Amino acid sequence: MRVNITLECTSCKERNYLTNKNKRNNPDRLEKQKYCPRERKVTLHRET
């Protein structure tokens, strides 16, 4: 089951990115180091 997901910056809680993932292949919340435009630096974003 592949679903659209939102990656939110952990630092400022800003829903910066939209992506998608297969729940079965990745049961746990995804986490990626992405650039947060609000904070203007690379931060850890975790699916919401």
Partner: protein, 235 residues
Amino acid sequence: MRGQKMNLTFGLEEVYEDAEFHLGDFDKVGIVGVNGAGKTTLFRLLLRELKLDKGKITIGNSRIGYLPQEIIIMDEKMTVLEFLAEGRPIKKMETELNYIYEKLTVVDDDKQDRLLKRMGWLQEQLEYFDCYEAESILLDLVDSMQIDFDLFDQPISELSGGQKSKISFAKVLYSKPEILLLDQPTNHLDSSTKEFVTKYLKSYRGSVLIISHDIDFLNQIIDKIMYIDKVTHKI
């Protein structure tokens, strides 16, 4: 206790889907469901250990007495008395209070306001949990389940499964709670010990939620039965 639009999904397998429940006060609720239904998970939500993915779970401000389904032995060398004593926050507050006194000597006129406020609450809180409990607990074992004092000085990890269940149940009572969340309170008890637990829960005036796979045990106590469905993911 109330929950609305409850949602919870560990990975791909979901537990609650738009589940709801309202429990009135002073209700001896018997929680029933197959293994994995999510009975233990409900308590974790009540204890705020878990958070619903979506929805609101509402709990009263009253103090909650929680009896875990599995015994929590932080260290192997912990003694039964240490384990039981940890039920009450007397020791924890005293350690904080002792440190507050240390800061008072070090700090003259800087942090006194914060320290003085913290000290006052600890004393008031300590008195609220009257420090006479040291004697009450010693006799709570006797009147509760005929727990011998030789066990009182023995490491908890060395006790038998039935003995551990008695200690854990006594620990819950030692905390003097307002709401009872019992997760299989008679898992290992023998016939004689189960008798005491039943009588106390019948007499217990407050609200008590019981997760049990013992039908006869529940029937003697339960007035309201909450069923956690495994297929509909509802309550």
